C-alpha cells in the first residue's frame, strides 16, 4: 500500500539536475504539502547524492549505489528493492535518482510528481517512457514566468489507474 512517488523537474523529456534538493516547483495552492512531505524517506541514485553532497535532513536518505557508502547519515542499498525494503512502513516514499534510478522503478512506482520547465536547459539523461493508458493526471497546473518565478513550469502529479 506504499505510496511509491518518482519526482522530476524535466524539460521535455530531459531530467533537470535542480539547486533544491527536492526537484519539484509547488504551486502556490499546494505549498501545504510540502509539510507533509518532511518525514518520507527519499530514494536516489550515488551520483544525484554527490550532487547534493549531503542527506536531506530530518527524514531517512536512501541512497542506490554498487560502490561502499561514503556518509553514516545515509542508508546505502544495492537494488531498488533493498531500497524499498529500507523504507519500512512509510507511507510514501519520494524517488529522485538518476533517469536509471526513474526507470527502475517505474513498475513500482504509483506516482509521479513531474515539474515541467521547457525553457530550462534539460541534462543529460531523459525521464523513462510510460505508458499513458496506466497513468492518469490528476493536478496539473501552469504558472507564467513573472518577477517572482524565473520560469514558467507546469506542475503535474500522475497516479497509476
Ligand atoms: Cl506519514
Ligand atoms: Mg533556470
Given at each position: 500500500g506504499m505510496i511509491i512517488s518518482l519526482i522530476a523537474a524535466?524539460?521535455?523529456?530531459?531530467?533537470?539536475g535542480m539547486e533544491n534538493a527536492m526537484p519539484w516547483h509547488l504551486p502556490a495552492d499546494l505549498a501545504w504539502f510540502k509539510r507533509n512531505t518532511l518525514n518520507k524517506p527519499v530514494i536516489?541514485?550515488?551520483?544525484?547524492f554527490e550532487s547534493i553532497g549531503r542527506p536531506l535532513p530530518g527524514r531517512l536518505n536512501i541512497v542506490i549505489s554498487s560502490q561502499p557508502?561514503?556518509?553514516e547519515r545515509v542508508?546505502?542499498?544495492?537494488?531498488?528493492?533493498?531500497?524499498?525494503?529500507?523504507?519500512?512502513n512509510a507511507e510514501?516514499?519520494?524517488?529522485?535518482?538518476?533517469?536509471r534510478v526513474y526507470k527502475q522503478f517505474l513498475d513500482r512506482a504509483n506516482r509521479?510528481?513531474?515539474?515541467?520547465?521547457?525553457?530550462e536547459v534539460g541534462g543529460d539523461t531523459h525521464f523513462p517512457d510510460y505508458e499513458p493508458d496506466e497513468w492518469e493526471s490528476v493536478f496539473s497546473e501552469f504558472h507564467d514566468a513573472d518577477e517572482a518565478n524565473s520560469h514558467?513550469?507546469?506542475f503535474e502529479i500522475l497516479e497509476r489507474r
Open positions: 524535466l524539460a521535455a523529456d530531459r531530467v533537470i536516489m541514485g550515488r551520483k544525484t557508502g561514503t556518509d542508508t546505502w542499498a544495492a537494488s531498488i528493492e533493498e531500497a524499498l525494503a529500507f523504507a519500512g510514501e516514499v519520494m524517488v529522485m535518482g538518476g533517469g509521479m510528481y513531474l515539474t515541467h520547465i521547457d525553457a514558467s513550469y507546469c
